[PDB]
Amino acid sequence: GSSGSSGHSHSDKHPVTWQPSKDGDRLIGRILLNKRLKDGSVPRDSGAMLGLKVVGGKMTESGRLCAFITKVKKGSLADTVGHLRPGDEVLEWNGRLLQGATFEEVYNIILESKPEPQVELVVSRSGPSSG
After folding, report:
1. From CA 126, how far away is CA 32, in angstroms rounded?
2. What are the residue boundaries of the structural domains of the chain, listed by start?
3. In a 3-state reduction of DSSP, which class is residue 53?
4. 1-131, which class in CATH?
5. CA–CA separation, 84 and 21 (whole Å)
6. Which stretches of the chain are assigned E, i.e. beta strand?
7. CB-CB neighbours of 56 under 10 Å
């Protein structure tokens, strides 16, 4: 008769990824979070906020806005899988740039991506670079 299977591996096999920028002085950290239970279905709510708190519309010293991690729950998505921590800057969120985004804008995102199955964050920290 006939028998097959067909199964090819997919690229991008890593939720969390920390890589330097084009220059290097900067570090681009990419975090990802899922919800879809083992079966592959999102529950009624497995932490809309994942676990870590993000505060956007924060006024910097440059007069610009940026979202930064205020606190990170111990033993939650954004901690166990994300490993996020308080002091990081969420550049993007699921593709939503927070840079400049207002306090609401940032919140809105997480909102529009609250029911989402997964959550791909993007942080960027300034590594060592004095002189």
Report:
1. 20
2. 1-131
3. strand
4. mainly beta
5. 19
6. 17-20, 26-34, 52-59, 65-72, 89-93, 96-97, 118-126
7. 23
And the tokens for 1?
């008769």
- Dist. CA 97–CA 65, nearest whole Å: 11
Spatial contact of 110 and 121, defined as CB atoms under 8 Å apart:
no
Cβ-Cβ contacts under 8 Å for 98 (sequence gap 6 or more): 54, 56, 66, 67, 90, 91, 92, 105, 106, 109
Number of H helices, E strands in the chain: 1, 7
* Burial tier of 69 (Cβ tally within 10 Å: 0-12, 13-18, 19+): buried
Experimental technique behind these coordinates: NMR
Of 31, 42, 104, 38, the closest CA to residue 67 belongs to: 104
